[PDB]
């Protein structure tokens, strides 16, 4: 007799998920204000 | 009685001898009219004081 009809293929296996990425580093801080202002001469006498 | 010149002064420095700081510019006793007391300069004591 002919053999029994073979069975169909079984379903594929499920896939895994994907992890999230770490936070990027904080931005570089700016350098302080541009130098001091020019010096003042000073005025008058200041004597009573 | 005291004064402060620079900003970061922890305690107000006292006026040195032979000098005086009044409470206000117009509540003084002997001040030449051409000056005022902001609070950062301790004026010199006038002649006869």
Buried b (16+ CB within 10 A) or exposed e, B13-40: eeeeeeebbeeeeeebeebeeebebeee
What would the two tokens of residue A38 be? 């020019």
How close is the nearest chain A Cα to the Cα of B10, in Å? Answer: 24
Solved with: cryo-EM
Sign of the alpha-carbon dihedral angle for B26, B31, B32, B36: negative
**Integer Cα distance of B49 and B36 in angstroms:** 19
* CA distances (Å), origin A46, targets A12, A20, B24, B33, B41: 95, 69, 17, 13, 8
A31 vs chain B: nearest CA distance in angstroms? 23
What are the tokens at B12? 């107000």
A48:B35 CB<8 A: yes
Which chain A residues are Cβ-neighbours of B32 within 8 angstroms? Answer: 48
Instruction: Decide if B43 touches A, using CB distance below 8 A.
Output: yes
Resolution in A: 3.9
């Amino acid at each position: 007799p002919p053999p029994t009809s073979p069975p169909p293929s079984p379903p594929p296996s499920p896939p895994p998920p994907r992890p999230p990425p770490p936070p990027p580093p904080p931005p570089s801080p700016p350098p302080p204000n541009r130098s001091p202002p020019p010096p003042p001469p000073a005025s008058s006498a200041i004597n009573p | 009685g005291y004064y402060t010149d620079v900003d970061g002064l922890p305690i107000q420095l006292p006026c040195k001898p032979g000098t005086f700081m009044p409470f206000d510019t117009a509540t003084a006793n002997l001040l030449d009219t051409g000056l005022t007391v902001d609070g950062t300069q301790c004026y010199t004591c006038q002649t006869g004081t």
